[PDB]
Amino acid sequence: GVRFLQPFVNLLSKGTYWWMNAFIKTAHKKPIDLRAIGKLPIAMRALTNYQRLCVAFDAQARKGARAIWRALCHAFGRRLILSSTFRILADLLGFAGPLCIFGIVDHLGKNAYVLAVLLFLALLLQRTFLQASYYVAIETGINLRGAIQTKIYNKIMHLSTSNLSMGEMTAGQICNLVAIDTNQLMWFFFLCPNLWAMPVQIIVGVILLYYILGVSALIGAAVIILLAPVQYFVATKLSQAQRSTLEHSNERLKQTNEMLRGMKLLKLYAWESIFCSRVEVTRRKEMTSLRAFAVYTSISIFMNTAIPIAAVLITFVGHVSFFKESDLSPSVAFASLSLFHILVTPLFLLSSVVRSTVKALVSVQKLSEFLSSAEIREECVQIIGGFFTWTPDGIPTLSNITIRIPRGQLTMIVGQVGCGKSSLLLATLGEMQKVSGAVFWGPVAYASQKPWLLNATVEENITFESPFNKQRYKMVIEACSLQPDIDILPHGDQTQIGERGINLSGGQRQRISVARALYQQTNVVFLDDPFSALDVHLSDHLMQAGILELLRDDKRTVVLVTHKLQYLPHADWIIAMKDGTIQREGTLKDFQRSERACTKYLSSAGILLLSLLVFSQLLKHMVLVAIDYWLAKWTDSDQSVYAMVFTLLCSLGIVLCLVTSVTVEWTGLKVAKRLHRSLLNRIILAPMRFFETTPLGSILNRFSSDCNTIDQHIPSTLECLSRSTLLCVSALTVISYVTPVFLVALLPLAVVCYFIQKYFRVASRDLQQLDDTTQLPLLSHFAETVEGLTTIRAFRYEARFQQKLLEYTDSNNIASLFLTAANRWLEVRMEYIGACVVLIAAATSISNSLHRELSAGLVGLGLTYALMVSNYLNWMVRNLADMEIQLGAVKRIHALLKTEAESYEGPSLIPKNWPDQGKIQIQNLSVRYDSSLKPVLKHVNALISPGQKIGICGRTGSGKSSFSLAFFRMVDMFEGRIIIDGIDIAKLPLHTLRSRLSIILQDPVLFSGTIRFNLDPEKKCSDSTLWEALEIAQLKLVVKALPGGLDAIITEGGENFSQGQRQLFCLARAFVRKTSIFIMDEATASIDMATENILQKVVMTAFADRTVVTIAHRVHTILSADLVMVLKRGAILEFDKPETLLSQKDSVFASFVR
Ligand SMILES: Nc1ncnc2c1ncn2[C@@H]1O[C@H](COP(=O)(O)OP(=O)(O)O)[C@@H](O)[C@H]1O
Ligand SMILES: Nc1ncnc2c1ncn2[C@@H]1O[C@H](COP(=O)(O)OP(=O)(O)O)[C@@H](O)[C@H]1O
Ligand SMILES: [Mg+2]
Ligand SMILES: [Mg+2]
């Protein structure tokens, strides 16, 4: 069952893609689908390409960055060679055409119709073989893409998480790798067959022009030899800028990644200016690289036009009067112009080719450095002599661990923050094979400390490739405290969980991960603090239902690592860790007995610059057509008059063309930088609702792809399109002038071409849309596999995931293949149209201009322009399609620009310093996340006296985090009044409101850089200040134990710091901010109670003269406060006296909970 049949048709059809007819006809009748399009052939599957590639890679290794390149060239092989041979034959015929022109003109001056028929056949043949060469190059490229994609996906498996902690294996870096390297390698492998025919082409060009010029060859030969070395030097100066360009863009992308996943914390206390100025500086450096590249390309185009025109002028002048004394018959003149144009076209192309060439080189260097990452080491739960560290060599954290875990038994690991608990969990998991030690125990379910979700439905995230079960799934759901929240969602179930779970809450994702690890059938289950983002009551219900009733039912083995009170009397073994060592060991008793798109684009381009561009282009082309017409009327013959006219026009042409190129490059640069500056400040001024709503992957990929296309694809493509359209205009005008009868044969051509273009347009749009809709999920899958590595390699589901990726990549490949096949079919029929027009143009010429018109000079112009446009027609159509795609790109940028309604900040209270008196009062407050949705708060009324500690309590979904977010005006549908020292938002813009408070979140984020950049991005602190802030935040000892104390390199999250240490760093931000009001949303989330109590005591003794409002799921912290308010289903209630607030409720909500 297949629909694509290129290898499955007859000899004559493969060239024309006749088979496509049905398909393109079918597409208009019914829209296209993935089940509509077929499967991939036997010789097209990514499995066989990966097979061939790995076999060649092995053969190359038995005999580095160069090795894989050799292997690629080997693997494509014969197909690639064939593409080159087809192109060379097409080139020889393309040169053959102008010779037929020479013969026709010669017989016109005096076996002529034969010249027309043979010329028509030759042109048709060249077109056929050129399009076949392009098709086979595209085939080789798509197979390359598939093979290297599956190779890197297989290698991501054996990659160790110690690389993932480093910047080299950054998830964003790996997805950038996949996407941009697909792109760059595919484009280089489409342009490589084109350049493997430039040398043979130029050689045949000169060997043909000798026999036409004679002794006057010297001038053209000197010109085309003087061209080469200066071009080599220019290309060198170009490549040097381009490589640094790539480095700077690669760092900008990671800065954007770490800027967007933390826009909440960024806008919370408004660190925006710092990150925005940093991205602006990176953009300025990138722009320096780009402007160097653009000036060099402008000089390149200047040379590639100026040297040619001088060559033509010199050669002709030399032949007529300088030495030769043989009158150049017009045939020689026009044939020389034709061969010369054929020679000129490759030189313009090679300059654009370098852009893809150095990019392919850089992409392969990156791919080889990625393949050279560290492997994974091939080998009751038993451990004797534990010893391992996180590098090939270094000081260890795992030292002398001995542990026995009998089946059907609960084991609580406990210990301070940073005691190798998760590390013991991962080493036991075999993900980290110890240096020296024995470990014995299978497919093990496991819920990691930082959960992750798949781009799928909830039911799918909980099944995880296992078949469904009526009672099993319902039990796992009804034990995880998840059914009410699931039913509250917009779709009662199968809700498409967004990327990473943005449209989910903090506790929801944790409960979903625990449900996944609890639903699967296995012996051993590891639970890595599954109680961080849960309250007291949900934790009690989950531990009682799933862990004690559901798990202990089947007598499975459970290793659960957390720190609570209820769990200890329930487990059988207890393991105390300290500084990577087991302090004590055993059971409990023995342990207790032991010791709208193009308008703004053109406006940003400038009404003065694009106008000058169009004007200069038109003027240059008018000069070019006029000089050729004048020369034609002169050749068939005031000789000095014509000589001066020719010499004047030959300088006018180069002046005008140089001006055109310079203007085009300037326009491109301006568009690039204005668009980027607009984009970033449109994203910065967005509300948090827009950031949570929008999928972030779309934002980032649109950002990178669109900006790269505009920076590097829009100038060249736009200028080539303009050149081709002006060439077409010139050719049509010339043919109309030479034969006023051709206007009878032009309308049928236009009508047929118009109808076929209309038919192609809808099928092309459909194929492009399907291409995008299949290309998004593949990259989603790549990202999710890269981040959720530990779980996938714990289950040992690697076969299932590799099979899934094979499915997705095969669908992507078939979509791309059909898009390029439709492209090829349109090109072939357009080339047949061009053959028709040139044929009957030459026929009407040889008939009319000889029999009845009797004109000599017009024949050369007519045939030259016809042979020129017969190729520039297809070239022009391709350039127009490229411009359309890039303009749709620009259009999606412009559509992204204008959303995120202003929500902007908009001086009587600013001039007065923000008061230290922390007296605040909220009267009749409500809150709604989305406009016209359910209310979250209702009739909120509270007051807070100056300099007093304030506690808040409540169940899940009560509204504590909503209370905090509304205290910062992060929820845009609040109703009521918020007064702070007789001062509210009535006279204050949002910036002074972002500077007045401090906030610590339950979700700890940490962007890469140094410790100084995480602690104070403003760089306005002394080192003693930060050392004191760390010694107060109970973090000094773990900071001193790192290389480069205050300058240790931090990566985004990673394992350089556990969750508790990230919480402590957020606390340190709060310490150094030095504001009057504090908000603390669960600073207890991932800190041990033993350290948490003393940490809270020290943080109370430190922040004595300022108001602090806390929301902690720890009872004792709530107990220590004076004014505590309990949030209800929608409302609150305040109470002050510790002895009165505990018996007034009749001991219900605050006493028995304690
Ligand atoms: N991949 C890694 N690279 C560097 N250091 C690590 C890595 N993994 C763990 N560590 C170190 O070992 C300790 C492991 O702490 P951990 O067991 O995760 O704490 P907890 O279980 O309380 O969250 C941390 O202090 C950390 O510094
Ligand atoms: N970003 C959001 N978009 C839409 N609804 C939200 C959002 N955040 C919270 N909610 C809703 O608000 C209610 C409770 O708010 P929340 O601040 O999350 O309470 P808690 O902090 O106790 O979890 C929940 O029913 C939840 O569905
Ligand atoms: Mg941990
Ligand atoms: Mg919360």
How is this structure best described in words?
It is built from 38 helices and 20 strands. The protein has 1154 residues and is α/β, with parallel strands linked by helices. It folds into three domains: 628 residues, Up-down Bundle (ABC transporter transmembrane region fold), CATH 1.20.1560.10; 182 residues, P-loop containing nucleotide triphosphate hydrolases (Rossmann fold), CATH 3.40.50.300; 216 residues, Rossmann fold, CATH 3.40.50.300. Helix 6 packs antiparallel against helix 29 and helix 8 runs antiparallel to helix 13. The two termini are 67 Å apart. The site of one magnesium ion has 4 residues, from helix 31.
What's the gist of this structure?
The protein is of the alpha/beta class. It has 3 domains: 34-373 and 610-897, ABC transporter type 1, transmembrane domain (ABC transporter transmembrane region fold), CATH 1.20.1560; 398-579, P-loop containing nucleotide triphosphate hydrolases (Rossmann fold), CATH 3.40.50; 920-1135, P-loop containing nucleotide triphosphate hydrolases (Rossmann fold, 3-Layer(aba) Sandwich).
Helix content: 55-70%
Q: Quote the beta fraction.
A: 5-15%
Bound molecules: adenosine-5'-diphosphate, magnesium ion
Compute the number of helices.
38
For the terminal residues, how far apart are their CA atoms?
67 Å
Q: Based on the structure, what is the oligomeric state of the protein chains? A: monomer
Number of domains: 3
Q: Which topology of the largest domain does CATH recognise? A: ABC transporter transmembrane region fold
Shape: elongated
**CATH evolutionary superfamily of the largest domain:** ABC transporter type 1, transmembrane domain
CATH architecture of the largest domain: Up-down Bundle
| Largest sheet: number of strands, sense, barrel closure | 6 strands, mixed
Topology, number of strands:
20
Q: Structural class, please?
A: alpha/beta
Radius of gyration, CA atoms, in whole angstroms = 36 Å
Strand order of the largest sheet: 7-8-9-5-10-11
Text of the CATH class of the largest domain: Mainly Alpha
Binding site for ADP 2: 689, 692, 929, 957-962
Binding site for ADP 1: 390, 418, 421-422, 449, 1055, 1058
Membrane topology: Multi-pass membrane protein
Binding site for Mg(2+) 2: 449, 528
